[PDB]
């Protein structure tokens, strides 16, 4: 009768217990409280199964309750939040109507477009992609042959780390742009009160971690430790021999 999925450690029957967490890689909005300068935020967690834990947290923030009407987007490793028109130029969208086509979809409605006009006015500063890519986000490490920032370095950020699902390779900037525009549309719908506030205690937005994934975490960590140790003793066997 002992149908049992458990382990025997030191001769005592041990069992795992399923953990849970919020679902990764899924859009949530929020309504942070009034005294904070932020009113609505959007979040994206991400993962990629699961090299160096792949946290890669992203926000899109809104300000004011008027004139503070602005959409600053945070991003690692950029130490300041950025207005989003800079990011659209950085991905390589110049003309503003097509930034708007990325953001909103029904050209007939307008309330979102008057809602976005101040961010466009913020975007009046910079009219070229690398002249947007230049912007600072120092956060280490030491700069190489640069003038202010490598455009190559910034585009390497946007390629490798940023939004580590839909792609990671080299050439999918338009996909990144549409994804960003969809995110903005969701946030803007929440703050424009056509769509209600998200919920966190809906069950489907949770996943149950279990024995396989838990063993995957321990195994990845232990094997990366192992790889570091085997990379040691191979460079420093300068003297004989190849053991």
């Amino acid at each position: 009768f002992d149908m049992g999925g458990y382990f025997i450690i030191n001769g005592s029957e041990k069992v795992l217990i399923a953990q849970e967490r919020s679902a990764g890689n899924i859009v949530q909005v929020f309504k942070k409280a009034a005294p904070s300068p932020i009113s609505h935020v959007a979040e994206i967690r991400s993962a990629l199964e699961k090299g160096s834990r792949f946290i890669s947290t992203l926000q899109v923030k809104l300000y004011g309750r008027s004139s503070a009407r602005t959409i600053k987007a945070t991003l690692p490793y950029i130490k300041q939040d950025i207005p989003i028109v800079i990011i659209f130029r950085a991905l390589g969208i110049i003309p503003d109507g097509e930034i708007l086509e990325h953001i909103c979809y029904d050209v007939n409605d307008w309330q979102m477009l008057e809602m976005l006009k101040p961010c466009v006015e913020d975007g009046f500063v910079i009219q070229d992609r690398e002249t947007a890519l230049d912007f600072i986000g120092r956060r280490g490490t030491a700069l190489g042959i640069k003038k202010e920032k490598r455009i190559q370095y910034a585009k390497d950020i946007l390629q490798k780390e940023f939004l580590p699902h839909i792609t990671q390779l080299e050439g999918f900037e338009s996909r990144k742009a549409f994804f960003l525009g969809y995110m903005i549309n969701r946030l803007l719908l929440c703050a424009l009160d056509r769509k209600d506030q998200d919920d966190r205690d809906h069950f489907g937005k949770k996943r149950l971690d279990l024995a396989g994934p838990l063993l995957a975490q321990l195994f990845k960590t232990l094997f990366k430790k192992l790889t570091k140790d085997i990379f040691r003793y191979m460079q420093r066997t300068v003297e004989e021999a190849h053991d």
Binding site: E101, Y105, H165, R175, Y182, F203, R207, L210, G212
Partner: protein
């Protein structure tokens, strides 16, 4: 609960190719004006493109997962109110028979 069960995940990439082959527009030539009402398609969160006639795909995927050619942990939703279509195939979901 008694008939509850846990998803164990399955590679999305046959679903992706299949779903491209039965008619999509990959995002790289999507334009909002010429398709003012076509439906977004998501697979585990990643957008993969837009499609014109959603109902045929939706019933086709139902028939395919009922015929046993897709691992039945896969769950699909056509949120008709917002022109959305989601495919989920990650591990860790909770499901019960019906």
């Amino acid at each position: 609960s008694l008939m509850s069960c846990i998803s164990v995940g399955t590679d999305p990439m046959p679903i992706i190719t299949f779903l491209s082959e039965w008619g999509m527009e990959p995002l790289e030539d999507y334009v909002p004006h010429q398709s003012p009402d076509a439906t977004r398609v998501f697979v585990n969160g990643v957008w993969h493109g837009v499609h014109r006639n959603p109902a045929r795909l939706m019933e086709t995927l139902r028939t395919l997962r009922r015929k046993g050619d897709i691992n039945p942990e896969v769950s699909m939703i056509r949120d008709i109110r917002e022109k959305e279509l989601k495919i989920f195939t990650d591990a860790g979901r909770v499901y019960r028979p019906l």
